Design a protein around this ligand. Structure first.
Ligand code: CLA
Ligand code: CLA
Ligand code: CLA
Ligand code: CLA
Ligand code: CLA
Ligand code: CLA
Ligand code: CLA
Ligand SMILES: CCCCCCCCCCCCCCCC(=O)OC[C@H](COP(=O)(O)OC[C@@H](O)CO)OC(=O)CCCCCCCCCCCCCCC
Ligand SMILES: CC1=C(/C=C/C(C)=C/C=C/C(C)=C/C=C/C=C(C)/C=C/C=C(C)/C=C/C2=C(C)CCCC2(C)C)C(C)(C)CCC1
Ligand SMILES: CC1=C(/C=C/C(C)=C/C=C/C(C)=C/C=C/C=C(C)/C=C/C=C(C)/C=C/C2=C(C)CCCC2(C)C)C(C)(C)CCC1
Ligand SMILES: CC1=C(C/C=C(\C)CCC[C@H](C)CCC[C@H](C)CCCC(C)C)C(=O)c2ccccc2C1=O
Ligand code: SF4
Lengths: 31, 135, 466, 30, 742
């Protein structure tokens, strides 16, 4: 189960920020 | 419609940015009795021409500031124009040809409150309403 | 002419051919005088007990390497060859002196241009053929001079060799192009052309230089300069001077590097130990030659720049009174015109970058930009990453690069998505074919493909460095 | 410690407040 | 026209009337106080003479008289230092034993137990150990007894008296006209030739006739009582001949250009005297002679009354090129009509010079027994760096004051000053960038290193044992200066400084000076200096270039030099004034110089200073920990601040206890400053309202209505206490540490 750390920590570190900042950027610039 | 030659030594990095092309631009015209040096709104010693001068400016505050400096040169015939990207020039100062500090008949009171400032309502009174306490 | 002050007095006869000629023969004479007179000056105070390198004799080392009166172990046994050479120059100086003072003021101010033989020597800075022929004419004499060194190295005695410390005759010159030109490509050492370690490559080098100079000699006298040369170069008389100064500066630095590191063509028995060495407090001949000609190369580079920038200002139709800093034809605009932002070189370069270059599709722009950025971005990740000192240094670096380029691809998609909102075109200095949502998608597709490719290509070159 | 199965159940059970947190957040935005 | 003495007689009648009329000098202040703001304004405007009167002649007279005042107080101070040396010091004991006795010239009175501060300083004397280097100055002067100091002190009090009289006389009695003041060519001639040239010739005289002989005998181990008095070397030539044979030749070799006959008392030795570890007096003699000649020649450049000479206006006007339009035309008028333009220049370059002096004095310790007095070395370096930094920021302030008040567009049209104003956005944008670049690629390397060390990855650090950043250029320059003697300086025996290279020079057991090797820690700290200087310049240059106007406030010159803002509009215009850029530049000057003196302190203690074994092995004060520690912030926190603060925090119940109290006191004053900097006037005026209510309630409300400090004064008080507190902390730290280990 320890292997989940190798999946989740990179996701919370990179995937989640990129996805969140990408969406929020597109939302705050929507006209 | 804007007549006047651009003053000598009018060049600097403090001039018009992309806003002047995209949003809005201002011009200030004035008739000088004599060619004389004046400080530009955004730095640099420019030279007025004898006769009609036209200076493009990013902000209306540049015009009013320069206007104040032209008054020190005994010049009170300066006109500020707002210019839109469609080339819609609008004369904006002095609005009615008379300077705003001088009283002119025809002008109506705008945003006048017929009360002392102490007589404004409390914020609680105008809560969840559209109106503010200074309305 | 008359606008130039006495301090810039030699600029008065730029357009006057006679004075300019007379000045060149006169200065030639001055170089000959020095070469000849200082050879005698050095002969007069040669102590055969003490070595040459710590006496302060510069020309005798240059005569010594040619193998003029030396026995075994680089020992100067006879000095008559130094005297005969010294006097030959010193008399040639007096003949060139005469020629100098004649063409200066006694001769005509302008060399006449006509169909007669005296007419040939006359020239104009605009007629490009006549200068090209003069380039070729004097190139034949550079070739001749290189073949005279070869003849000295092969037939007339030979050259001094530091391997056996004797004056061996050269018989088998290296006529292999791959070997001799390999020096230009840094094949046989990090030092390049200054990494020569035998006379066989030196004679071989001067064969190749000899035939190239003679080959170029025939070319330039029999051909006029083509339309591509007609556009890229400046054609004022001061433009040619600035080019020649760039060459002299390059040659000065070349010889300064040679004398510093090379010991074959500059023997340690004459010039002294390699690098910068001082024996018994006395500075070695090598150090003097190296450091002087390094300093003169920096000065002659400063001369190239000065004379080149002056040409570029004059040809732009700018004077030095109003200057090189102007306004944008609309003074009240932000920017100023400067040689950094408005120079034809700057404008031509920027316009021709893939982002601005006419006739490139949105994809092709992205692709070229991608390839360039993807290529150079590999370096830092490979060579400074956490796995840089492991077997996975290149592979780690490549995956990092692809990684960064994928986030940069998302950044592009975000930038486009933000701006392209049904009709409203993006602000900023875009090309006309990147002002639609589909064109921007193509540009992003271009970037991705380009950047991945550029990275992959750098990786294939890095991993196959063998 | 706890089994790999128990960790996988917890993650699947954690999708429930994950879903409902999304639904509440979207409803609170209106 | 001709330079001549032209004065008005009895321009200002002397009377105590105006002494009884506080704020007489300003028309606004003359009406009297209504609020407590008046009391501040009085002091704030006191010496702002441009606001007193419009007349440039009256301003020039006030400035000339004030200077005689400042010369008088500086002479009183220098006389006091020498008097305290004569009366309340162990100078004579210290002469007999320089290496063992500790210099002290301040004795504390026995009251409330403060006599503890009178520590055992050696020479059977109890007092505060001094770090001003006065003993090393007086030894260099060739002073050998208390009587010579008494004479010098009294002489000073007479000179201070003369300076007071001069200031009163040249204001109240015979005040020069503006014509006099504007003779810049005559002033430069007299100040180059007499003040500097004849001062340096005069001093060469003293060195050659008094200092060199007396010091030579003291270095030969002759007892102070046995050494002849300085006049005995003039009256009895035989004594001087014995030390310097060249005096046998007399003055004829000077007039016949046989100057080699003086090679024994006018030397170019280089390095340091091995006895004292200071520069050779004979080198210093020849220096001051050579300086004197170059100055006396230099000060015949400017035309006065005889046609020969340059006019500075013509020089300036002629220096223009194809980038700079009219070039330096109009700058002569700026510098001869504005006192602020001169004060800007003189503060900028005197400040820059004081920092050069700091560097040159540690590397080439000019005084005998200075190099080994590690307390003096650290303190005079730090002192002169601080004075330098304040003067430079003053330069920028008065440059901005000039731009707001004294700048004329007509004089300065298409000149270098006009043209810098026209690309000020290009200047500040580029300087902004280079500041961020230097910040990332200097400080970011420390953060990289801290993180790598913390993650247990020392191989990934920027260090000598990891990814190296060798300062190859500084390393190459050190080598050139080390090879100079015999090579590119043939007539030099040693290098100018052992810092560049050569050997470790040691006096007593201790290292006077040795080569200061540069590596990754030296590369990193140098790029921190570059960063912190470029950011200070960004702030100050932005202050001067945007003082008159900006894209935000077009009419900023009308608001003046010192105004708090132009209101919360335009998003908020807090601290746009040239004054507020000086305010922000002071913090960055403080930040910059703090890291400079910390760099010096740690580098010298780890890599230079220390004891020398008989074999010749150097044991440094902090055992060369700089290379591995000074490459992380944690290393600075631990091995510098934490480690070396042990002496100051453990000083209570000893003679260094005062530094322990100063250390806390300074930490307090610093923290107190944050009240002024972080808060605003609005809060304090509203609090004062309630306090005023209570005073009104008990009928003790003052007629002079209490006001919260002005927005500008709030900031001025803030930065004052911040600098005082911060600098005083380091001062207490440095002393307590270096008076224990050094
Ligand atoms: C929060 C989570 C997080 C995680 C899990 C990581 C993980 C990593 N970082 Mg760190 N980093 C982070 C936050 C994070 N970072 C932040 C906030 C900063 C700024 C303070 C940094 C600053 C930093 C620096 C300066 C460096 C790292 C490096 C690394 C790698 C070192 C391991 C190694 O030596 O193998 C070697 C591993 C590789 C060479 C890369 C493996 C493949 C990459 C991760 C992705 C491949 C493409 C991917 C499939 C798709 C696109 C990318 C993305 C959208 C997912 C590792 C992948 C080092 C590195 O190697 O950079 C690339 C490195 O130099 N990080
Ligand atoms: C070093 C070699 C050298 C040589 C060969 C020359 C040669 C010449 N000089 Mg030059 N000159 C030189 C150095 C030299 N100069 C230097 C160092 C200076 C600075 C003092 C000058 C300053 C100078 C001036 C002011 C003038 C010349 C002129 C000339 C030409 C003389 C024509 C005439 O008599 O009228 C001749 C081609 C004259 C010329 O240019 O005529 C067209 C002329 O007016 N020279
Ligand atoms: C100003 C005075 C000055 C003096 C006294 C010298 C003297 C010398 N030069 Mg230098 N040179 C100079 C300026 C000077 N140079 C300048 C300004 C440049 C341009 C930067 C050069 C570029 C240069 C190069 C490239 C070389 C020399 C070389 C030499 C040496 C041999 C000359 C020779 O045989 O010609 C060659 C004669 C012919 C080809 C006949 C035609 C000699 C010591 C040579 C040398 O061996 O020095 C290390 C050499 O290779 N010079
Ligand atoms: C800051 C860190 C950094 C680092 C560590 C590197 C590292 C490298 N660069 Mg890069 N580079 C950088 C910044 C950096 N670069 C920057 C800012 C630019 C400007 C955009 C470049 C532009 C550049 C070019 C154009 C090239 C490199 C190349 C290289 C590689 C040379 C290896 C070699 O000798 O192969 C042997 C030499 C060759 C194969 C030469 C082929 C021609 C090496 C991996 C070379 C490369 O990519 O190698 C494949 C290369 O051609 N760099
Ligand atoms: C700010 C300066 C700074 C610098 C220079 C470095 C440098 C480095 N870091 Mg460190 N780091 C820093 C701050 C810094 N760090 C900070 C603040 C942290 C957070 C605490 C870290 C945390 C960290 C981690 C966790 C790791 C690193 C690592 C590294 C190394 C590899 C990084 C890499 O591959 O990036 C690649 C860089 C680029 C792709 C950008 C290159 C920029 C180019 C060269 C600019 C070119 C401009 C050009 C000259 C101008 C135009 C050219 C013209 C022709 C047009 C490298 C030595 C890694 C390592 O392994 O250490 C050895 C690693 O694992 N760093
Ligand atoms: C310019 C700066 C300067 C400073 C900071 C000092 C500071 C000091 N002096 Mg010194 N002094 C100076 C110049 C200075 N002096 C000069 C120019 C002279 C020559 C007249 C003296 C002659 C002098 C004597 C004779 C004595 C001092 C003493 C002192 C100490 C006590 C002060 C005092 O007596 O308060 C007294 C309070 C008032 C006068 C105000 C009530 C104090 C450390 C005393 C000392 O060191 O005792 C051991 C002491 O006896 N001073
Ligand atoms: C520690 C305290 C601190 C710090 C870090 C800063 C930082 C800065 N100041 Mg400030 N300043 C400070 C105190 C500080 N100041 C105080 C107390 C005052 C009141 C006097 C000021 C007043 C002031 C003025 C008047 C000016 C500055 C300016 C600057 C900037 C200079 C440019 C630079 O170096 O950029 C580089 C950035 C740094 C050195 C910060 C650290 C960088 C880290 C190590 C790298 C990034 C790591 C990583 C990528 C982080 C993100 C990842 C994460 C989100 C996952 C810089 C951002 C100047 C400026 O803006 O000019 C350019 C300027 O003119 N400051
Ligand atoms: C730096 C070299 C330097 O100062 O160049 C010199 C050059 C000025 O050349 P000029 O020949 O016009 O100088 C003439 C007078 O100003 C000097 O008396 O400066 C500039 O072009 C502006 C500064 C840009 C600097 C950018 C950084
Ligand atoms: C000095 C100078 C300069 C220069 C510099 C630089 C900029 C450098 C860099 C460089 C670089 C930056 C380069 C680059 C290159 C690149 C390359 C060479 C690429 C390649 C690529 C490829 C070939 C690819 C391929 C592919 C693709 C695309 C896709 C698919 C896959 C493949 C692989 C097939 C300039 C001009 C600015 C200016 C003047 C001065
Ligand atoms: C420390 C002090 C002091 C003291 C001081 C003193 C004591 C000083 C002095 C000074 C001096 C004592 C100086 C002098 C000088 C001099 C000079 C500067 C001279 C010059 C000369 C010359 C220049 C010459 C010339 C000539 C002639 C005449 C003839 C022949 C020729 C000739 C050229 C050689 C006092 C008390 C104030 C207090 C404070 C501190
Ligand atoms: C504390 C603080 C105050 C309050 C401080 C004030 C009003 C200063 C008052 C202190 C002095 C020392 C009062 C002196 C009064 C008498 C002269 C003392 C007479 C008694 C002596 C003779 C002993 C501000 O006004 C302020 C304004 C703007 C920004 C920040 C701040 C800020 O931080
Ligand atoms: S907060 Fe203070 S400084 Fe800022 S705008 Fe308001 S009054 Fe002015």
């Amino acid at each position: 189960a320890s292997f989940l750390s190798s999946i989740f920590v990179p996701v919370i570190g990179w995937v989640v920020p990129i996805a969140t900042f990408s969406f929020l950027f597109l939302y705050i610039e929507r006209e | 419609t804007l007549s006047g030659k651009t003053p000598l030594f009018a060049g600097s990095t403090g001039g018009l940015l992309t806003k002047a092309v995209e949003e809005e631009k201002y011009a200030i015209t004035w008739t000088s009795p004599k060619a004389q040096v004046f400080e530009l709104p955004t730095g640099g010693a420019a030279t007025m021409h004898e006769g009609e001068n036209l200076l493009y400016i990013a902000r209306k505050e540049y015009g009013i500031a320069l206007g104040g400096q032209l008054r020190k040169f005994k010049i009170t015939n300066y006109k500020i124009y707002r210019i839109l990207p469609s080339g819609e020039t609008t004369f904006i100062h002095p609005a009615d040809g008379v300077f705003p500090e001088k009283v002119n008949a025809g002008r109506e009171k705008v945003r006048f409150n017929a009360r002392s400032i102490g007589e404004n309502p409390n914020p609680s009174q105008v809560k969840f309403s559209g109106k503010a306490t200074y309305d | 002419p008359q606008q130039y002050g006495w301090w810039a007095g030699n600029a008065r006869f730029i357009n006057l051919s006679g004075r300019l000629l007379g000045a060149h023969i006169a200065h030639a004479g001055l170089i000959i005088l020095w070469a000849g007179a200082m050879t005698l000056f050095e002969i007069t105070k040669y102590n055969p007990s003490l070595p040459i390198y710590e006496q302060g004799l510069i020309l005798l080392p240059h005569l010594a390497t040619l193998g003029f009166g030396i026995g075994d172990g680089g020992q100067i046994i006879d000095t008559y060859p130094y005297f005969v050479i010294g006097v030959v120059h010193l008399v040639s100086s007096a003949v060139l002196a005469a020629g100098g003072i004649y063409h200066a003021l006694l001769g005509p101010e302008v060399l006449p241009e006509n169909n007669q033989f005296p007419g040939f020597f006359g020239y104009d800075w605009e007629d490009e053929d006549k200068m090209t022929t003069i380039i070729g004419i004097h190139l034949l004499l550079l070739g001749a001079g290189a073949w005279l060194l070869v003849a000295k190295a092969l037939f007339w005695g030979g050259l001094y060799d530091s391997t056996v410390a004797s004056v061996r005759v050269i018989t088998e010159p290296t006529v292999n192009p791959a070997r001799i030109f390999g020096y230009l490509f840094g094949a046989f050492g990090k030092q390049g052309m200054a990494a020569v370690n035998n006379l066989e490559d030196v004679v071989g080098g001067h064969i190749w230089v000899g035939i190239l100079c003679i080959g170029g000699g025939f070319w330039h006298i029999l051909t006029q300069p083509f339309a591509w040369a007609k556009k890229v170069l400046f054609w004022s008389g001061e433009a040619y001077l600035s080019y020649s100064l760039a060459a002299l500066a390059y040659m000065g630095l070349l010889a300064a590097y040679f004398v510093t590191v090379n010991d074959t063509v500059y023997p340690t028995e004459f010039y002294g130990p390699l690098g910068f060495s001082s024996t018994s407090g006395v500075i070695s001949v090598r150090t003097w030659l190296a450091t002087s000609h390094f300093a003169l190369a920096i000065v002659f580079l400063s001369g190239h720049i000065w004379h080149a920038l002056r040409v570029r200002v004059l040809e732009a139709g700018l004077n030095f009174e109003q200057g090189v800093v102007n306004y944008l034809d609309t003074p009240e605009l932000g920017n100023l015109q400067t040689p950094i932002n408005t120079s034809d070189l700057t404008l031509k370069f920027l316009v021709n970058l893939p982002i601005y270059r006419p006739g490139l599709s949105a994809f092709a722009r992205g692709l070229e930009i991608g390839m360039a950025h993807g290529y150079f971005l590999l370096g830092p990740f490979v060579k400074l990453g956490p796995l840089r000192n492991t077997e996975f240094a290149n592979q780690a670096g490549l995956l990092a690069t692809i990684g960064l380029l994928l986030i940069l691809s998302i950044c592009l998609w975000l930038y486009g998505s933000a701006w392209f909102q049904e009709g409203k075109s993006p602000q900023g200095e875009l090309p006309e074919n990147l002002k639609t949502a589909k064109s921007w998608s193509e540009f992003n597709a271009g970037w991705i493909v380009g950047s991945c490719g550029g990275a992959l290509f750098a990786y294939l070159l890095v991993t196959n460095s063998s | 410690s706890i089994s790999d199965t128990q960790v996988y159940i917890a993650l699947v059970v954690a999708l429930i407040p994950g879903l409902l947190a999304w639904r509440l957040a979207t409803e609170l935005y209106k | 026209k001709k330079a001549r003495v032209i004065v008005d007689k009895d321009p200002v009648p002397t009377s105590f009337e105006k002494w009884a009329q506080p704020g007489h000098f300003d028309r606004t202040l003359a009406r009297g106080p209504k609020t407590t703001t008046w009391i501040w304004n009085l002091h704030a405007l006191a010496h702002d003479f441009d606001t007193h009167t419009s007349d440039l002649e009256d301003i020039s007279r006030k400035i000339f008289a004030a200077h005689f005042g400042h010369l008088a107080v500086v002479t009183i101070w220098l006389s006091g230092m020498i008097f305290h040396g004569a009366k309340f010091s162990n100078y004579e004991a210290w002469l007999s034993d320089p290496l063992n006795v500790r210099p002290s010239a301040q004795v504390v009175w026995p009251i409330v137990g403060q006599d503890i501060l009178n520590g055992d300083v050696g020479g059977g004397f109890h007092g505060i150990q001094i770090t001003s280097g006065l003993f090393q100055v007086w030894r260099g002067w060739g002073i050998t007894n208390s009587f010579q100091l008494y004479c010098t002190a009294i002489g000073g009090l007479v000179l201070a008296g003369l300076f007071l009289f001069a200031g009163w006389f040249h204001y109240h009695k015979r005040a020069p006209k503006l014509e006099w003041f504007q003779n810049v060519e005559s002033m430069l001639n007299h100040h180059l030739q007499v003040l500097l040239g004849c001062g340096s010739l005069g001093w060469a005289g003293h060195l050659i006739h008094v200092s060199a002989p007396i010091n030579k005998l003291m270095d030969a181990g002759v007892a102070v009582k046995d050494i002849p008095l300085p006049h005995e070397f003039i009256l009895n030539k035989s004594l001087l001949i014995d030390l310097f044979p060249g005096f046998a030749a007399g003055l004829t070799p000077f007039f016949t250009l046989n100057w080699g006959q003086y090679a024994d008392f006018l030397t170019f030795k280089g390095g340091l005297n091995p006895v004292t570890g200071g520069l050779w007096m004979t080198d210093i003699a020849h220096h001051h002679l050579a300086i004197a000649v170059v100055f006396i020649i230099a000060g015949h450049q400017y035309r006065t009354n005889w046609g020969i000479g340059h006019s500075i206006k013509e020089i300036l006007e002629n220096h223009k090129g194809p980038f700079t339009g009219e070039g330096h035309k109009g700058l002569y008028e700026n510098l001869t009509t504005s006192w602020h333009a001169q004060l800007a220049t003189n503060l900028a370059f005197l400040g820059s010079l004081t920092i050069i002096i700091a560097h040159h004095m540690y590397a080439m310790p000019p005084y005998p027994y200075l190099a080994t007095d590690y307390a003096t070395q650290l303190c005079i370096f730090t002192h002169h760096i601080w004075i330098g930094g304040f003067l430079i920021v003053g330069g920028a302030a008065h440059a901005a004051i000039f731009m707001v008040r004294d700048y004329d567009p007509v004089v300065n049209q298409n000149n270098v000053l006009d043209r810098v104003i026209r690309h000020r956005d290009a200047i500040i944008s580029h300087l902004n960038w280079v500041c961020i670049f230097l910040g990332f690629h200097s400080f970011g390397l420390y953060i990289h290193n801290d993180t790598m060390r913390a993650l247990g990855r020392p191989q990934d650090m920027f260090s000598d044992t990891a990814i190296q950043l060798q300062p190859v250029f500084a390393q190459w320059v050190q080598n050139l200066h080390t090879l100079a003697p015999g090579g590119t300086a043939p007539n030099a025996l040693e290098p100018v400084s052992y810092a560049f290279g050569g050997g470790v020079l040691a006096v007593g057991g201790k290292v006077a000076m040795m080569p200061i090797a540069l590596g990754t820690a030296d590369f990193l700290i140098h790029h921190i200096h570059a960063f912190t200087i470029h950011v200070t310049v960004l702030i100050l240059l932005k202050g001067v270039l945007f003082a008159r106007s900006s894209r935000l406030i077009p009419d900023k010159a009308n608001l003046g030099f010192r105004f708090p803002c132009d209101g919360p509009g335009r998003g908020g215009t807090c601290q746009v004034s040239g004054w507020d850029h000086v305010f922000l530049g002071l913090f960055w000057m403080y930040n910059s110089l703090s890291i400079v003196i910390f760099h010096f302190s740690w580098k010298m203690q780890s890599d230079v200073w220390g004891t020398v074994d008989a074999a010749g092995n150097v044991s440094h004060i902090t055992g060369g920990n700089f290379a591995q520690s000074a490459i992380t912030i944690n290393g600075w926190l631990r091995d510098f601040l934490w480690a070396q603060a042990s002496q100051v925090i453990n000083s209570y119940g000893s003679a260094l206890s005062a530094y322990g109290l100063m250390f806390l006191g300074a930490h307090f004053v610093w923290a107190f400053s944050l009240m002024f900097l972080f808060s605003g006037r609005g809060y304090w005026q509203e609090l004062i309202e309630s306090i005023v209510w209570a005073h009104n309630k008990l009928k003790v409300a003052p007629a002079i209505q209490p006001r919260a400090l002005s927005i500008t004064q709030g900031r001025a008080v803030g930065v004052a206490h911040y600098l005082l507190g911060g600098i005083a902390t380091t001062w207490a730290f440095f002393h307590a540490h270096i008076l224990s280990v050094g």
